[PDB]
Design an enzyme around this catalytic site. Sequence first.
Site, PDB file in Angstrom:
ATOM      1  N   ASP A  25       0.803  -1.221   0.000  1.00 23.69           N
ATOM      2  CA  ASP A  25       0.000   0.000   0.000  1.00 23.69           C
ATOM      3  C   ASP A  25       0.841   1.279   0.000  1.00 23.69           C
ATOM      4  O   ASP A  25       1.277   1.772   1.044  1.00 23.69           O
ATOM      5  CB  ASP A  25      -0.940  -0.037   1.182  1.00 23.69           C
ATOM      6  CG  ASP A  25      -1.781   1.189   1.290  1.00 23.69           C
ATOM      7  OD1 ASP A  25      -1.929   1.913   0.273  1.00 23.69           O
ATOM      8  OD2 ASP A  25      -2.305   1.404   2.404  1.00 23.69           O
ATOM      9  N   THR A  26       0.976   1.872  -1.184  1.00 30.66           N
ATOM     10  CA  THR A  26       1.745   3.097  -1.316  1.00 30.66           C
ATOM     11  C   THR A  26       1.091   4.273  -0.618  1.00 30.66           C
ATOM     12  O   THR A  26       1.762   5.281  -0.378  1.00 30.66           O
ATOM     13  CB  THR A  26       1.915   3.409  -2.789  1.00 30.66           C
ATOM     14  OG1 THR A  26       0.613   3.546  -3.366  1.00 30.66           O
ATOM     15  CG2 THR A  26       2.654   2.269  -3.485  1.00 30.66           C
ATOM     16  N   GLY A  27      -0.192   4.176  -0.301  1.00 32.56           N
ATOM     17  CA  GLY A  27      -0.899   5.200   0.434  1.00 32.56           C
ATOM     18  C   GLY A  27      -0.817   5.073   1.942  1.00 32.56           C
ATOM     19  O   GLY A  27      -1.529   5.783   2.658  1.00 32.56           O
TER      20      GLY A  27
END
Lengths: 99, 99
Positions: A25-27
């Site tokens: 999850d880059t967020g």
Amino acid sequence: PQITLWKRPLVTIKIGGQLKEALLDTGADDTVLEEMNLPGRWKPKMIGGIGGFIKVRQYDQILIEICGHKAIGTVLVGPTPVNIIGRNLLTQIGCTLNF
Amino acid sequence: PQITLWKRPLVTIKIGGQLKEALLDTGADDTVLEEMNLPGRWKPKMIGGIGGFIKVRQYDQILIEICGHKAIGTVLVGPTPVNIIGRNLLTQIGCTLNF
Ligand SMILES: CC[C@H](C)[C@H](NC(=O)OC)C(=O)N[C@@H](Cc1ccccc1)[C@@H](O)C[C@H](Cc1ccccc1)NC(=O)O[C@H]1CO[C@H]2OCC[C@H]21
């Protein structure tokens, strides 16, 4: 490898000697895993997202292996609906977004 | 381009003719933007996240440009803490995770 985004980017990780499925999850600033009893000292923390905050346990210098790539960093444990691998560990495996 | 994750992967997007900053988020199924006045009809929807659920306005077939890449798809508008570009649009611009 290369992971497309047609489905949730779920991968197998190894942590505390257990295998689990987790979301790349880059967020996410941080890594958050479903409730598990990990040995060692921990510190209370609150982390937030859409919908509000949840209470978690912060464990430091935890080893995790993500598709054979090793990473070491802070891992939070609490009542999250899904195991999330966040940027603090994605940077260590050399993960990039490309388009 | 290739984007590393040492910092939040924030980018400029263009929607309804306005420019905004948004997070490229492989951990979000859907795209969710802070309150804005968007043209078109909309239907109420709820989406959940790490903290619970929020009420959003679902807009379908919205044009949005993400660092010059065009996408047309569903955009949710509501009280999210940050503008998030989810997989429904990341797939349209050819985004993959690589490590
Ligand atoms: C690190 C602590 C948190 C994990 C992290 N917060 C943080 O980093 O704040 C600094 C955080 O919440 N990140 C999210 C984006 C985000 C929102 C708000 C502020 C900052 C960043 C996102 O990346 C992960 C989240 C994972 C998930 C949770 C529940 C069910 C399924 C998946 N996805 C998500 O909410 O998605 C929404 C939107 O689309 C829908 O599909 C999935 C569910 C729906």
